[PDB]
């Protein structure tokens, strides 16, 4: 409807991912992962094979995949520490250290 009425193109990732703000939490992390892997400052070329073959864009896919896996393990280290605070002895200082 937004294309037909000429409007600004919406982010289709946020339209689809809000269907994963419902029940299945694994589909919710799957859409979070898809979104972090489409967070890419693409070269606006008329060729997908040249953009997917770029050295810069393939560095960006790995830079995002590492950021996703790092925030994933940051969520795991947060949840593990907040469940076990009496062992963990977190105190009162914020930061990953």
């Amino acid at each position: 409807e937004k294309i037909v009425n000429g409007h600004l193109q919406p982010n289709l990732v946020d339209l689809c991912a809000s269907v994963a703000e419902l029940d299945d939490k694994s589909i919710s992390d799957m859409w979070t992962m898809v979104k972090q892997m489409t967070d890419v400052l693409l070269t606006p070329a008329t060729d997908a094979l040249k953009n997917r073959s770029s050295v810069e864009v393939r560095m960006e896919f790995v830079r995002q995949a590492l950021a996703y896996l790092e925030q994933s393990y940051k969520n795991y280290t947060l949840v593990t520490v907040f469940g076990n605070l009496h062992q963990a002895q977190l105190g009162g200082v914020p930061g990953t250290y």
């Binding site: 694994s26 799957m30 393939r58 995949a65 590492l66 896996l69």
Partner: protein, 96 residues
Amino acid sequence: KRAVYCIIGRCDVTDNQSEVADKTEDYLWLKLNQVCFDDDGTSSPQDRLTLSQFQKQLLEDYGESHFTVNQQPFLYFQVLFLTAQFEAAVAFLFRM
């Protein structure tokens, strides 16, 4: 002390740091930091992982039976999508 060096020096691609990497994410994260894109001919090939070698390694040199796809489908989707094999990840996710 091994794992931190194998990351920072992009070396020992044939070690998996399995005393430190608990899970499939940690294999992905180890090997993804070990990636090069660049033909620096001073790198010996026994230390040289490209993204395209790692893409093939997951899709063809391990495959759908290695990741137990029928029981953990989102983990194999994670393995393909975090290696930017988006078309293979869709042609997997459009089966089940």
